[PDB]
Amino acid sequence: GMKIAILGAMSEEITPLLETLKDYTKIEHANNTYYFAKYKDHELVLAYSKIGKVNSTLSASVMIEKFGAQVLLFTGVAGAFNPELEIGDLLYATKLAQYDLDITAFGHPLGFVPGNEIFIKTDEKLNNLALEVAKELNIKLRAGIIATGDEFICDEAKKAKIREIFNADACEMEGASVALVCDALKVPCFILRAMSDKAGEKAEFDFDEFVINSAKISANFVLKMCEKL
Amino acid sequence: MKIAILGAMSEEITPLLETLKDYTKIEHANNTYYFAKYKDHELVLAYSKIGKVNSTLSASVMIEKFGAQVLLFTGVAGAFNPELEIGDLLYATKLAQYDLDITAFGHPLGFVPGNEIFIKTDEKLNNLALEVAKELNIKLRAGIIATGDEFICDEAKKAKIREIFNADACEMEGASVALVCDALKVPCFILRAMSDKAGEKAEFDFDEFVINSAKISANFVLKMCEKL
Ligand SMILES: CSC[C@H]1CN(Cc2c[nH]c3c(N)ncnc23)C[C@@H]1O
Ligand SMILES: CSC[C@H]1CN(Cc2c[nH]c3c(N)ncnc23)C[C@@H]1O
Q1: Can you tell me the distance from the alpha carbon of B214 to that of A82, in angstroms, rounded to the nearest whole number?
Q2: Element (H or E) spanning B76, and its range?
């Protein structure tokens, strides 16, 4: 069977999986811990990267280049931009951009550097698998664009600008970087986020209130996807 | 030992490929990685493409896939310290990500849990650079570099980042590369030659001086390879 990596950013996003698995082997590498487990006869490597683009890029690269993961599922929470999203709602990214990658001084569009794309796509077959799981389990699942950058967004004006430029439905600090790594290394990637907040005024309070539960929702979903891989 | 030499742009690495003359290349991770022998060292070289994610990926690939045991970063930067002139060399003692921001939760700018604000480079490589600078009569300054995913060309932003971090220069790849190297237990050296002063019209100075400043930095890191 295919070797699966499951990646989140924070302990809250991955600990629910570790608790469900119960039995696993911990390996210290890249100033972090990587967890190795067998789930319903699937070989898994799991980790939380620590927050942000650099940490999540490094973890995705380690999971693939060092440990040989063949498919990568990202699980965690996000800030909702689309007004139809509520706290706890699941969104998978069809494509992702880095909103804070800015060499626009040279005439490039926001989010662009030479040699790369503005938007990185996720894997079609994995996205269709997620739609099958959502139907099976009667779980509401939305498709959308995720905007990634190294700021916790809690500002209606910033939210509005990023939504306008990229038609983004949510924001977070790891998806586009993870997707870029997977695309570069020819590994199918799936990015799932459960909303923890609405990325506006007082979003830090909502994040703290809802991160634990929203993280569990996304974590459970990706574990169910593993069963179809 | 196996040595990685990494830049962000073609201009930062092509001067080394011209000097080395003979090299092989492998296509991997949506990039090209170059391989050559130099003074009893296998070198692996690349330009990452611009910014934090691209440079993180290349550093990780060079170490995890191609087995680099030391990494030298070479390229250009925007000067913040008023004593720096275009063309001057600066090596980083430590670096921060000025645009890594979870300050809503009370943390300082540049901090996320599990990491520190500043990431250090390797003391022994830095001391080797001082020896090379002494030997070659090259002026070399030590300082703090602030890294982020924006080209800085605004006097107010320059001043803010300089004040918060006491940064001597800015760029878009150093802190990320240094973090990867530190995490993977690989000694890292970050060298930059100034291409601009990161204020008004910095985009025009950058275009004018990138080629020459890139050559200055490149030459220096190759001289370091002789003493390793
Ligand atoms: C403690 S920093 C937030 C952590 C959880 N992440 C996802 C996220 C939820 N709400 C967000 C928002 N308003 N702005 C940016 N990111 C997010 C990213 C980071 O790992
Ligand atoms: C075409 S984008 C600029 C490329 C060269 N870089 C170093 C650099 C020089 N001057 C800088 C400045 N004012 N602001 C940020 N970065 C730099 C980073 C990027 O690879």
Answers
A1: 44
A2: strand B70-79
A80 in helix, strand or coil?
A: strand
**Would you call A142 helix, strand, or coil by DSSP?**
strand
Interchain pair A150, B149: CB under 8 A: yes
- Collapsing DSSP to helix, strand or coil, B23 comes out as coil
Which amino acid makes up residue A167? N
Q: CA of A154: how far to CAs of A192, A208, B169, B211, in Å?
A: 21, 13, 29, 41
| Beta pairing partners, A25 | A36
Given a contact cutoff of 8 angstroms between Cβ atoms, the answer to whether B33 and B44 are in contact is yes
Distance from CA of B33 to the nearest CA of A (A): 14
Locus of tokens 């008004």 = B200
Query: For residue B194, which of B84, B109, B114, B32 has the smallest C-alpha distance?
Result: B84
Residue with tokens 């924006």: B150
Instruction: Say how far apart CA A179 and CA A189 lie, in whole Å.
Output: 6
Determine the Cα–Cα distance for residues B73 and B127; give it in Å rounded to an integer. 16
Helices (H) and strands (E) in chain B — how many of each? 6, 10
Distance CA B53, CA A69 (A): 20
Beta bridge partners of B15: none
A 10 A CB-CB count for B123 gives 10
Structure tokens at B92: 């980083």
Contact B182, B44 (CB under 8 A): no
What CATH code is assigned to A1-229? 3.40.50.1580
Technique used by the depositors: X-ray
- The whole-angstrom distance between B198's CA and the closest CA on chain A is 12
Question: Ligand 1 centre and the CA of A156: distance in Å?
Answer: 15
For residues B148, B194, B165, B104, the Cα torsion angle rounded to the nearest 10 degrees is -20
Which residue in B28, B33, B53 has the most chain A C-beta atoms within 10 A of its own C-beta, making it the best mutation to test that interface? B53
Q: Angle at Cα B95 formed by Cα B92 and Cα B98, nearest 5°?
A: 140
Extract the tokens encoding A72: 């990568």
Under CATH, which number does the domain B1-228 receive? 3.40.50.1580
d(CA B58, CA B114) in angstroms, rounded, equals: 22
